[PDB]
């Protein structure tokens, strides 16, 4: 939950960038894509660590 909500805030961030002119469409796209990529990485790592720490 925590991480996803963070990634949601960051999503808004990227959106604002795109609206400010600092980003074009495709780099906003790429940034969103890598954000969700590393978010998937995040939750995966969190899953394995949660298994190892709590229920081996």
- Percentages helix, strand, coil for the chain (3-state, rounded to 5) are 85, 0, 15
Resolution as reported, in Å: 4.0
Residue 27 CA from chain centroid, whole number:
15
Task: Give the whole-angstrom CA distance, residue 32 versus residue 49.
Answer: 25
**Torsion (CA) 34, 5, 48, 42 in degrees, nearest 10:** 20
CA distance 45 to 47: 5
| C-beta neighbour count of 31 within 10 angstroms | 17
């Amino acid at each position: 939950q925590r991480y996803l909500e963070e990634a949601d805030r960051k999503l808004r961030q990227i959106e604002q960038a795109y609206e400010m002119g600092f980003l074009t469409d495709r780099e906003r796209y790429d940034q969103v894509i890598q954000l969700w990529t590393e978010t998937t990485e995040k939750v995966t790592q969190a899953v394995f660590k949660n298994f190892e720490e709590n229920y081996p």
